[PDB]
Ligand binder design. Structure first.
Ligand code: MG
Ligand code: MG
Ligand code: MG
Ligand code: MG
Ligand code: MG
Ligand code: MG
Ligand code: MG
Ligand code: MG
Ligand code: MG
Ligand code: MG
Ligand code: MG
Ligand code: MG
Ligand code: MG
Ligand code: MG
Ligand code: MG
Ligand code: MG
Ligand code: MG
Ligand code: MG
Ligand code: MG
Ligand code: MG
Ligand code: MG
Ligand code: MG
Ligand code: MG
Ligand code: MG
Ligand code: ZN
Lengths: 239, 52, 146, 81, 101, 83, 66, 90
RNA sequence: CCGGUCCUAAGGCGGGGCCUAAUAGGCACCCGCCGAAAGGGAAACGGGUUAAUAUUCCCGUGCCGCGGGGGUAGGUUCUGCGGCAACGCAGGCCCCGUCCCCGACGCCUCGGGAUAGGGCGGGCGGGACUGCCGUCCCGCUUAACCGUCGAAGGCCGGGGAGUGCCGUAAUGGCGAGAACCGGCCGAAGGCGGGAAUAGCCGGGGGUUUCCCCGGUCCGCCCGACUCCUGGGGCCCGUGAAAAGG
RNA sequence: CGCAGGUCGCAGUGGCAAGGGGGACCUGACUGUUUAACAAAAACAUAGGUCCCCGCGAGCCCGUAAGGGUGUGUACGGGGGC
């Protein structure tokens, strides 16, 4: 037809969907975990970016968390406000001291954790405003945000860091990783297309496109989408 | 290959079976309705005014 | 009715080997049942010729010659015949069992056993005769090893 | 429930050699129904019932009687022989 | 020494595991004789490897080669009859493979 | 039947009958033996080859039987005794 | 089919047998008690075989030479 | 030896007074010895078979089992025939 | 007792609800169901028979599930017995709950053990050839099921080791417990029973497929792509679930 | 697996089976994919590089709507260009 690939992605086809049946479950904090727990397993999850620890609470509730680097099987973790700020412990942001490296941070209490969930990532506890029950934290991107002090986080940094430094040496390796992730692999460049299939397709000497405005409709909003700038000058202006 | 060589692959599959309601070879086994009378997706008989 | 099919089924051989005597050509048309075919087989008008087994006299003669050592020269080899990995396995097992038996019986100090064991693993010795000759020449045992 | 009897060569050989009667019955009849029907109608004891559906769409039953009743004798009694 | 006559121990291995008994004799460095009475706790009088018994804090006063009723009067003097009848309950969910490597 | 035998889920066993023929029998593979709930290793006294379900197996004469091994049971008993 | 070695054990099954089949060889006799469930076979010396057949016929168990 | 578990079960059952189980255990011990010896002789492992037969002779002396002696005599006759054939061929 | 039938997978359908001008249109929600004749998964094999069915018919020998009867071990306030232990042994009955485990899992590589099949020398029986020699070929088989044995591997008790000691195909192992001694659990498969009474080879008699006689053996070798077992390595790839047990 | 001797032919991996080789330029790194039925390529993809929109009640996309995909996810991440 004429609808482009980014428009076809939103339909939810099998080649664009995530095979989450390959995973044991969501890696989130259950709503009402408290007390001491035991690290029983550290497992690989297909398509995820870090090893996943299985924590067995003292009252029998078991949940999945991202494993802190240095966490080991048989370890005893503490959950709750009374938990000390040691590695693997799940503490409120309000109780966590400043300068602490946490991960799996909850923006609001009870969502399960949103930020610093990739391997080798972490958030830094910058400050505490207890009079509005907020915690200022720096996310992995360098952005400083306020989060609910009653929310929960884990002390330490996410294990599995350095996974992306090693090159994906063959196309087959990225193929096998894509089959576990949700990516459609591989991707055709826009200018390698014909004009019916992409705005960049067409001419005898095919060319890319200049940036489109932020108000551009779907099917037109490809390439640079309302970019502040492009290239090395843009990076320089950013820094 | 699209002609005679591809015709040899039509020897073992099927899209339709006989419909229990209308008896035609029109019951779509995967979609689970009849393409002639509409049984399985419409309790009223499927018949359109554009068809003689 | 096909007589040969019933006869082959009865005799438990191939239809290619079932043979019908021409003297029963008149009686073939009256054959109705496997009992009738059994009656003809009992009379001997239907029989099974013996199967052919490939004769092996030529092979046995050539195998004797090959055991003596003929017909295995450079012009008769087309691919790999010797297995290097299997040869290494056999070489290690022979030398290790010999040295371990000597140490178990006490003819070799464990340190000398260690030196010989590491040399064997490191491919110092061509064969068991070489190992025995080394042991006798360097006097690593109180009595000579045969 | 019984439609008729099968008096072919195979059925006659089975009757004479194995004490079996061959009947054509309704396609919906089960082995239990066939055995009870045979016992009620003919007052014999049924040993076992084997059933099949022919390529012409009929149910045929081989009814093996107990060891006190003759299938050939029963066929002669009903006169279907 | 901990494993001594008059000591209350709990058998850890075998059929009688988790059951309490009283050490009444010493065989050698490897074996001692235990009889936490079979009518009382269920541990018949016999030798046991000291590695297969876990000593408790409790201890009673009896003489070497003491009899079953001697151990019985010692336990009732200490008030330990119900403690001897109780069977130890493990918490299997706590143990990880590091503990049994 | 035939595709079920083309799949490798059953064992292909060649056997010579008393009638002099060679036939292929398709037999089930053995079921896995019970494992310890902590270590995952096979439990002693219960690791005999079993080929079908519904066969009652006798557990070893110990508390918790074919659920945990003697090592886990003894260590847990020691911890509970101290605790 | 099951095999028994002790005559005392085998007699408990053979006494209830529907039939006892006898097979003879130069050194030993196979006695096979055919019950509803199983066929119990024991190999015995010929003299003990004769004694057991005599006892079984005394108990009025059927005996057949196979 | 090989059927020591059967010997221990026999004596344990007799001490406990289970005559039926004692008879079953005696049968199992005889089965153990005779089956293992017969398989060894059929595979022509005569040294292992002779060790098993000596153990069976000791067990039959210890437990008063005539069937064990009879089957051992049959197996020893077979062993003698095998050894005679080996000596004649060699 | 061979498959469907049962289970769930990717997924789908129906009702309720929400949406819709409306429906026979949509589905995040709740409930139920369907979804594999190659996945998971109860239990049958050998011989004979027909013109045509053959794990279905017949003979023989068994297995599974459900239910019952007798005997037995056991029980009848209370608990089964033995062993230091690994663990072994008939281990009472009925109902309910919970937990755990099996079900349940990739690819590559190399060690070990078997079996199917194949071959060699001898023996017996039968067949092929007739220019010379006397060689060549065929048969000599053993199902499911019951019992017993059990390689690797793991484990228990004793022992208490650093001039080390013990090794592999290869990596190697030891006071965080080695060498060494004894024991426990434990494959394919073997063997006995089944079962020679079958089948087969040969030699006769009768007649519509029945009866009789002889043999169906001895010693070795190779050996899988079939079956079992263990070791090692790779993954930004981790190689299903449920019924059922 | 090897050694010694003898011996025939035109021919001994004798049939069967069974690489011609080398130098230089252009071009695409490579393996892979492509116009079923005239194009197999220097075209596409590729690992690698780099830029942009995005802190998640996001960015991008699908649906009339109810709502949905990315997402059982979280910047060592999702999406979009070269
Ligand atoms: Mg995909
Ligand atoms: Mg183009
Ligand atoms: Mg434009
Ligand atoms: Mg356009
Ligand atoms: Mg253009
Ligand atoms: Mg077309
Ligand atoms: Mg289709
Ligand atoms: Mg040649
Ligand atoms: Mg090499
Ligand atoms: Mg049927
Ligand atoms: Mg299946
Ligand atoms: Mg399977
Ligand atoms: Mg279904
Ligand atoms: Mg046919
Ligand atoms: Mg021969
Ligand atoms: Mg090697
Ligand atoms: Mg050619
Ligand atoms: Mg290229
Ligand atoms: Mg190429
Ligand atoms: Mg073309
Ligand atoms: Mg072309
Ligand atoms: Mg390109
Ligand atoms: Mg580059
Ligand atoms: Mg540009
Ligand atoms: Zn229809």
């Amino acid at each position: 037809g004429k609808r482009i690939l980014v428009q076809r992605r939103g339909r939810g086809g099998s080649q664009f969907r995530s095979p989450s049946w390959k995973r044991d479950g969501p890696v989130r904090y259950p709503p009402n975990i408290s007390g001491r727990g035991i690290v029983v397993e550290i497992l690989h999850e297909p398509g995820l970016n870090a090893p996943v620890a299985k924590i067995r609470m003292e009252n029998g509730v078991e949940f999945f968390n991202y494993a802190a680097e240095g966490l080991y099987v048989g370890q005893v973790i503490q959950v709750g406000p009374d938990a000390p700020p040691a590695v693997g412990n799940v503490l409120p942001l309000g109780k966590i001291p400043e300068g602490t490296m946490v991960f799996n941070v909850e923006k609001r209490f009870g969502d399960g954790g949103k930020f610093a969930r990739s391997g080798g990532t972490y958030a830094l506890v910058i400050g505490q405003r207890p009079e509005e029950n907020k915690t200022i934290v720096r996310l992995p991107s360098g952005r400083v945000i306020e989060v609910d002090a009653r929310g929960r986080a884990t002390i330490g940094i996410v294990a599995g860091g350095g996974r992306v430094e090693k090159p994906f040496v063959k196309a087959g390796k990225k193929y096998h990783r894509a089959r576990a992730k949700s990516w459609k692999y591989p991707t055709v460049r826009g200018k390698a297309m014909s004009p019916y299939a992409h705005p960049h397709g067409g001419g005898s000497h095919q060319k890319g496109g200049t940036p489109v405005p932020k108000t551009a409709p779907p099917g037109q909003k490809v390439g640079f989408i309302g970019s502040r700038c492009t290239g090395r000058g843009c990076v320089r202006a950013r820094a | 290959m699209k002609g005679t060589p591809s015709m040899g692959k039509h020897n073992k599959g099927k899209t339709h079976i006989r419909c229990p309601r209308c008896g035609r070879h029109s019951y779509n086994v995967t979609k689970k309705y009849c393409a002639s009378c509409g049984w399985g997706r419409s309790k009223r008989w499927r018949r359109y005014n554009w068809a003689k | 009715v096909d007589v040969k099919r019933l006869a082959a089924e009865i005799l438990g051989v191939g239809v290619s080997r079932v043979k019908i005597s021409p003297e029963a050509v008149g009686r073939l048309e009256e054959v109705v049942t496997k009992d009738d075919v059994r009656a003809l087989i009992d009379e001997g008008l239907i029989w099974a010729e013996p199967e052919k087994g490939n004769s092996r006299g030529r092979w046995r003669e050539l195998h004797e010659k090959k055991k003596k050592g003929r017909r295995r020269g450079q012009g008769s080899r087309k691919g790999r015949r010797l297995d290097e990995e299997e040869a290494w396995v056999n070489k290690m097992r022979v030398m290790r069992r010999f040295l371990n038996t000597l140490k178990r019986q006490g003819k070799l100090d464990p340190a000398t056993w260690r030196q010989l064991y590491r040399m064997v693993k490191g491919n110092y010795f061509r064969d068991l005769r070489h190992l025995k000759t080394y042991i006798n020449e360097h006097k690593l045992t109180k009595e000579p090893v045969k | 429930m019984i439609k008729r009897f099968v008096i072919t060569e195979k059925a006659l050989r089975l009757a004479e050699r194995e004490n079996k009667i061959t009947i054509i019955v309704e396609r919906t009849a089960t082995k239990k129904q066939i055995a009870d029907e045979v016992q009620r109608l003919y007052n014999v004891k049924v040993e076992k019932v084997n059933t099949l559906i022919t390529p012409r769409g009929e149910k045929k039953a081989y009814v093996k009687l107990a060891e006190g009743y003759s299938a050939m004798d029963l066929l002669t009694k009903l006169g279907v022989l | 020494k901990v494993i001594d006559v008059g000591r209350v121990v709990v058998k850890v291995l075998g059929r009688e595991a988790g059951r309490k008994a009283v050490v009444v004799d010493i065989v050698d460095e490897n074996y001692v004789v235990i009889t936490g009475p079979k009518s009382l706790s269920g541990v018949r009088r016999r030798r046991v490897n000291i590695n297969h018994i876990e000593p408790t804090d409790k201890k009673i006063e009896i003489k070497k080669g003491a009899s079953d009723e001697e151990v019985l009067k010692a336990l009732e003097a200490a008030g330990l009859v119900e403690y001897m009848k109780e069977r130890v309950k493990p918490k299997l969910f706590e143990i990880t493979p590091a503990d049994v490597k | 039947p035939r595709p079920a035998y083309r799949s490798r889920s059953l064992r292909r066993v060649k056997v010579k009958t008393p009638g002099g023929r060679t036939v292929v029998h398709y037999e089930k593979r053995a079921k896995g033996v019970p494992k310890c709930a902590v270590t995952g290793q096979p439990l002693g006294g219960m690791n005999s080859k079993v080929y079908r379900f519904g066969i009652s197996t006798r557990a070893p004469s110990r508390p918790y039987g074919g659920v945990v091994s003697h090592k886990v049971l003894a260590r847990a008993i020691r911890y509970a005794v101290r605790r | 089919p099951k095999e028994i070695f002790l005559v005392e054990l085998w007699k408990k099954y053979g006494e209830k047998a529907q039939v006892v089949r006898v097979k003879r060889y130069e050194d030993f006799v196979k006695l096979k008690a055919r019950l509803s469930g199983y066929l119990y076979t024991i190999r015995v010396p010929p003299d003990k075989a004769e004694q057991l057949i005599s006892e079984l016929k005394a108990k009025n168990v059927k005996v057949e030479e196979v | 030896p090989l059927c020591s578990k059967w010997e221990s079960l026999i004596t344990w059952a007799e001490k406990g007074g289970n005559s039926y189980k004692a008879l079953e255990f005696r049968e199992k011990l005889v089965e153990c010895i005779v089956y293992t010896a017969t398989e060894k002789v059929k595979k022509k492992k005569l040294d292992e078979a002779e060790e098993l037969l000596k153990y069976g002779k000791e067990v039959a002396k210890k437990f008063n089992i005539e069937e064990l002696n009879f089957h051992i005599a049959l197996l020893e006759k077979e062993i003698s025939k095998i050894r005679q054939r080996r000596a004649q061929a060699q």
